[PDB]
Design a protein around this ligand. Structure first.
Ligand SMILES: [Fe+3]
Lengths: 39, 341, 271
């Protein structure tokens, strides 16, 4: 919800965009965050 | 075949066979999880298959030692497959953020003394009790502030610096107010002017949210619908929003976050911009206060959440307080446990 | 008793004091017009003036802009070459007849630029929340370790590779010393020089090249004197052979020589 507080500057929430890469592309399951390398 | 797994211990050493295989000058690969499969069958001549692994951590690999370890193990039932059910060991987001600011191995690595410990104990207080964990990933690494943005959005909190010490601190946006002790603000008690006096016909706000999370057991994305029946039954067509909550590992917590967002963004959102004298100099973003303008604007003694604050200079006296209608914590409305077959 | 006076409608006193701190090298300022003395120190009345301690959670906008007279040594620290170590600014908010100046801001001195108002410069001071633009990209398997020399992971001893000597002759972006002559070329490539400044205290800045008795620095020269010794540290090529031969730290190396040329398991026949 901190996005909701971030949009506290709005003029009043629909969106349409592509993504800037994050850590989703999977090759090793992580039941907990051990972070990862980057190659 | 056999498998040598080296966990990258601080003083780790590996068998000479691995270095002979890789050949020439080689390191000990200290600090990194490195698996060595000496088995001769990597695959049949049909080209080798792809691999996957599964791990978890709570206390291992902490530069400078662990912090507050007795609340990091957020276990919770996150089963995929009803008969295949088993609990998963989600991490405490409070410890996630503490690592983000308390290790030089990536990011800034702020010293412990400059981090407000008691505030992270405060965070853990509610994060562990309600069992809000996380299983986030940080592959293809990006800017640190963006990752903290993601984590804060997951927990719905505010990272901030203590006014007195200057230490970095964390806040959570919750229901931590008793609606009795709150100070009452009217023109006769410190209020100077309501800079936001209009109403923008805020009756058609969002009424549906599609929460997307990631179950580690399935290790793929999952989704949850949440319809605010009250708004659908009167407003007509939907005003929906698909929101990202990857890393949340179960449907119960996904439902909790979905309900939190839906009740926060849908129920009578009103933004207050308040001109204040030296009556709220201690008031800090995220605080709570009650405002009253009954004889000019006719608003009935409402409780408001404090947002952005603009402290004044030695001249000009007043402080501008951006304020937002009440937020909410997690709670149980829906029973969305898909329980795959 | 501060809050009672502060929240009063018809009672109050003006004070806004500023503490400029650099490893305990102190300047105690007062925006008021008097010789204010509190917290066991005298806060001199200087032409400092705040522009508002804004807290919005947005970087750049919250940058506290101080109007600081140039003649102060605080600005003097930033003439030409700013300090190599961050300077912290603390603001306090007591009244008179009061003695608990509740601290209100603990930002650091990020940048300074003089301009149209020569009697006071603009000092920008954000806080920890807004300084988080770091790359984040750290590990990134490669043919050479990404570890910074002498860091917490390379762990090469800070004392085993000491080098120090007083400056034989300062020069334009270059320094000369007798000790450097005893070393092979490039021994300090990526190194840094260290000494104590009568005000900055510890000062550390890098070296970009070495040859014989001569070296070159990545940064500028803030003025140097052939007195104090320049505690100079060697750098490293950061190669596996470099970390092995020079440092004997191969066992604590983070670079992977045998990154298998990304020998795939797709596309073409292999294995
Ligand atoms: Fe090294």
């Amino acid at each position: 919800m901190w996005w909701a507080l971030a949009m506290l500057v709005a003029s009043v929430e629909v969106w349409t965009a592509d993504w800037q890469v994050l850590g989703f592309g999977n090759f090793r399951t992580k039941a907990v965050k051990a972070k990862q390398a980057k190659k | 075949g056999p498998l040598e797994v080296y966990m990258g211990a601080p003083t780790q050493t590996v068998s000479q066979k691995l270095k002979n295989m890789l050949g020439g000058r080689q390191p000990e690969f200290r600090g990194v999880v490195t698996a060595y499969f000496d088995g001769l069958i990597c695959a049949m001549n049909p080209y080798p298959k792809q691999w996957k692994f599964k791990a978890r951590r709570s206390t291992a690999g902490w530069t400078g030692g662990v912090w507050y370890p007795e609340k990091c193990l957020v276990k919770m039932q996150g089963y995929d497959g009803q008969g295949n059910q088993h609990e998963i060991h989600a991490m405490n987001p409070a410890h996630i953020l503490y690592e983000c600011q308390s290790n030089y191995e990536w990011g800034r690595g702020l010293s412990r003394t400059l981090i407000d410990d008691t505030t992270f104990r405060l965070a853990a207080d509610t994060l562990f009790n309600e069992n809000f964990g996380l299983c986030i990933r940080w592959n293809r690494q990006d800017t640190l502030e963006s990752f903290m943005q993601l984590i804060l959005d997951h927990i719905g909190g505010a990272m901030y610096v203590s006014k007195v010490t200057g230490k970095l601190s964390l806040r959570l946006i919750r229901k931590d107010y008793d609606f009795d002790t709150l100070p009452i603000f009217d023109t006769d008690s410190g209020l100077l002017s309501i800079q936001e006096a209009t109403n923008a016909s805020p009756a058609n706000l969002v009424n549906e949210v599609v929460v997307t999370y990631h179950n580690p057991v399935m290790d793929e994305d999952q989704q949850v619908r949440s319809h605010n029946l009250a708004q659908i039954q009167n407003q007509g067509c939907l005003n929906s929003n698909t929101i990202e909550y990857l890393g949340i590992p179960t449907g119960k917590l996904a439902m909790q976050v979905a309900q939190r967002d839906l009740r926060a963004a849908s129920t009578n959102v009103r933004r207050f911009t308040v001109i204040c004298d030296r009556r709220a100099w201690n008031v800090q973003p995220g605080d709570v206060l009650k405002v009253r303008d009954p004889k000019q604007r006719g608003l009935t003694e409402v409780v408001i959440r404090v947002g952005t604050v603009e402290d004044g200079t030695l001249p000009d006296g007043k402080i501008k307080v951006v304020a937002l209608q009440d937020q909410f914590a997690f709670q149980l409305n829906t029973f969305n446990q898909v329980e795959p077959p | 008793s501060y809050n009672i006076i502060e929240t009063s409608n018809d009672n109050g006193r003006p004070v806004f004091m500023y503490e400029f701190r650099l490893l305990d090298k102190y300047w105690r300022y007062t925006s008021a017009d008097a010789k204010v003395s509190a917290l066991g120190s005298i806060w001199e009345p200087m032409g400092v003036s705040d522009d508002g301690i804004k807290q919005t959670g947005e970087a750049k906008t919250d940058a506290l802009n101080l109007t600081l007279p140039n003649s102060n040594p605080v600005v003097g620290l930033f003439i030409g070459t700013p300090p190599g170590s961050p300077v912290t600014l603390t603001i306090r908010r007591m009244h008179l007849d009061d003695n608990d100046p509740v601290v209100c801001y603990v930002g650091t001195v990020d940048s300074i630029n003089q301009g149209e108002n020569p009697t006071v410069a603009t000092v920008t001071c954000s806080t920890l929340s807004a300084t988080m633009d770091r790359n984040g990209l750290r590990l990134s398997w490669s043919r050479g370790c990404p570890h910074a020399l002498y860091d917490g992971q390379c762990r090469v001893n800070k004392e085993a590779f000491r080098v120090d000597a007083t400056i034989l002759t300062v020069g334009a972006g270059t320094v000369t010393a007798a000790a450097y002559a005893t070393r092979p070329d490039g021994y300090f490539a990526g190194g840094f020089i260290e000494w104590i400044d009568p005000v900055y205290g510890v000062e550390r800045r890098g070296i970009e090249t070495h040859t014989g008795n001569t070296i070159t620095i990545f940064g500028t020269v803030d003025g140097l004197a052939g007195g104090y010794i320049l505690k100079t540290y060697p750098g490293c090529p950061r190669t596996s052979a470099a970390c092995d031969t020079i440092f004997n730290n191969l066992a604590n190396f983070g670079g992977i020589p045998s990154l298998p040329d990304r020998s795939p398991f797709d596309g073409n026949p292999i294995f």
